[PDB]
Every structure is written in C-alpha cells, then in structure tokens.
Amino acid sequence: SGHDQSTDVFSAEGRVFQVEYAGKAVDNSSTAVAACCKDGVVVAVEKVHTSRMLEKGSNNRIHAVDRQAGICICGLLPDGRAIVSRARQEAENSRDIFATPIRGSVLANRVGEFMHAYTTHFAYRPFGCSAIIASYADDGPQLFVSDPSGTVAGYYGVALGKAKTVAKSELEKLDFSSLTCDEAVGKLASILHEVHDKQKDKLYEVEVAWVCDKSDRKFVHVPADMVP
C-alpha cells in the first residue's frame, strides 16, 4: 500500500506508481492531436467546455512559449500552465543569454528535465499533463511530447487524451512527407470531430494552432475560417 503514496518510491517491479497515476490524468483528459509537415507543424486540441456560457478562448490549452515555439497542454490544465510558464522562462533565457531562438529539440528536453524533477523528490508530485511542444527554429519544424515522467520523444504525428487510441489510427492514414500546413489543419480538426463522444461532452470546441512558412515561422492560433 505504501509503494504508491509518493514519487520518491520505486515498487518491487521497478516503476514509480505516482507517475503512472499522473499519466492516467492525461488519458481521462480532452484529446489533443499534432502533425509535423515540411512547411511547419500543426497542433489541434478539443477543449471540453463544462458550462454553455464560457467565452471563446476560455481555458486556452495552447500557449505561445516563444515566437517560434508553443506548448499545447493535454491533462490537468493548471499544472500544464506551470510547464508553459517554465518553458517560457527557458525560451527567453535562450534569447537573453545566448542571443538565439531556443531550438525545439532543446526546449522539449528543457521541459522534460522540469517535469522529471517533480518525479524524484517526495515533497513534489508529478505533473498531471503531457505537453506538446511545437517549435520551428533553425533545427527545422519539430514536434515533441514531454509526458509526466519527463520522457521527451520527437513525433511526426501524435495523439494524447482519452481518444488517443482511435485518433492515432487516423494519424497513420496521413502521409507526413506530402501534407502541407493548410491540409493538416483540416485533417487534425476533422479527426478531433470524428473521435469526440457526442453523448458525454455535448459542449466543446477545437482550438487549432500552427507554426509554418505561411505564418512567418511564428506560433499562432489559426483563424476560425480554416478550422472546419
């Protein structure tokens, strides 16, 4: 029973239970989807709205980290914002100190080591969210997923959340060598519409954001005309 109360503790099988648990908070959360192209990278996320009366852009899951890099949180939103607030602090340390836009490869690894430091010590709990870092710095267009463990991994296409399984099947049908950033918006948004349970989560919208040669390698929410 004591093997799972803190993150400072391996079980006999050799796994941190508190991190697998935070990982369950991601897989009961609103489905996020992203796709790395040659042109750039696209992140879509379904936001499940609790009340009918929320504004447009309430509980914004996608955040600019720097000009070229934005996180899309999937999991506990508030935790995720602490990640974003960090990722930012790192991305601006890169501009202040080292005079350069943070590389996407670094920014992901910087965010992994942050989410990891909360899986080591007893005082902290692991982060409830996965982050989807989408950069387009000098290392080309990059997509990365930092999960609660701190495990960074680069993706072409990625799906997080409660639909992860079915949303990943639909990402495999795409050809990632071919697709542009303009097609991708339509297909990822088409995916999140298809997988989303209509009976459980009646009130929802599909916040999409990209960074590509279209947007001047600047990370922004796509206009509301491209979304469907």
Next chain:
Amino acid sequence: TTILAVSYNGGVVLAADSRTSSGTYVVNRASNKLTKLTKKIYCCRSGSAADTQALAERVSNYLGSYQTDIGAGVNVATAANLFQKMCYMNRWNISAGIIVAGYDPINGGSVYSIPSGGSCVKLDYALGGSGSIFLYSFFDANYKPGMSKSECVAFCQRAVAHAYSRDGSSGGLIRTITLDADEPEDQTIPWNRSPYCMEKDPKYVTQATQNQPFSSSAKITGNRMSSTG
C-alpha cells in the same frame, strides 16, 4: 595592445600584437591575445590580461556546455552576447576591451567589438587596445571591403604593424587567425620579417638635423658625426 578583426566574404581574420607591458617594461614578448572560445569563434583581448583571460575562460566554458547540450555549432552572436553580459555585469571592476570574431554556418563571418562599457556592435571590422587609435585613419584610407582571405590576412598584418610601430604599448609578433568553412589557419609573423617598421622604411633613414656643427653660415648641412669635424 593592438587587436583587429576584419570580415572577408567567407569568414574573418583576427590579428594582434604579442606584447603585454606593465607600462614601460615588456613582461611578455610573445602573448597569444587571440583566445579560442570554440573551434571557429576566437576573441581578441585588449586591457588587463587577468580580466580578459578570466572572461575568455568563463565564456569558453559556457559555449562548451551550450555546444554539447544543443548538439550543434555555436552562433558567433551567442559568443558575443555571452561576452557582452560578463563585460557589462563587471564593467566597473574590470578593464576589458574585447573583439569576438568567428564563423558559424548560418551568418558566416561575424565580428563584434565589445569595448570597455559592455556595448556590443556587430561590424565589418573592429579595432581594440591602445594601438587601435593609429589604425582608424589607416583603415578609413587603405581598407577596401570585399577582400580575398589572402589579402585580408596580408592587410591585417600590415595594419597591426603600422600600429605597433607607433604605439609603445604594442609590439612583437603579429599573430593572425582566419576562421571560415575550412580548418582555422593561425600564422605568427615575427618582427624581423614584419610587413612595415619605421626602422627599415626609407622615409626615416635620413636623420633629423638637430646636432649641427659650429659653422660660419646659417646654411644647415647635416649632423656633426666626428669630433675632428
């Protein structure tokens, strides 16, 4: 101290005298003032040897850590902005007048003057140290941008010489280094074969007519060189 970077098309040339004086006595005759930060990013060092050396090593360390973790080369900008921050934080304690020059594949041949204050000024060519002040006119006249790698080296040598020939503080060897796509070419012109010196220039052979014999005529001849004459 005389230092100068200049950019040619592909890359840059740093050039330096090799004299560190405690004012009027030459402590070291053969100091390398060109200090490697990374493979292709050298800084020149004017002012207190101590302070530039301590900053060159402190920055060469961060660029090493950076270069490892990003898993790629360092932009020269990065070297200059690190060197600006450290020259700026301590601008009151230290006496450091730096030139970060170098090559990265993105921007090519970049040169940054970081003088005393901790300003940081991307330029075509920078002059630092006591013996800078002589070159400024010499550049304005004879410098002509869009030089070949070969000429920019032969020039910088000529320049560093013109400076160290007039400046007391500056003198000795003219160390250059060319940083471009290819492997760094350092060369060390010894004084005995320097491109210019006042001693060997035919302008200054004929001595000033100061001494001048006891004569019966206002007609200036030459100096008195024998007691018999």
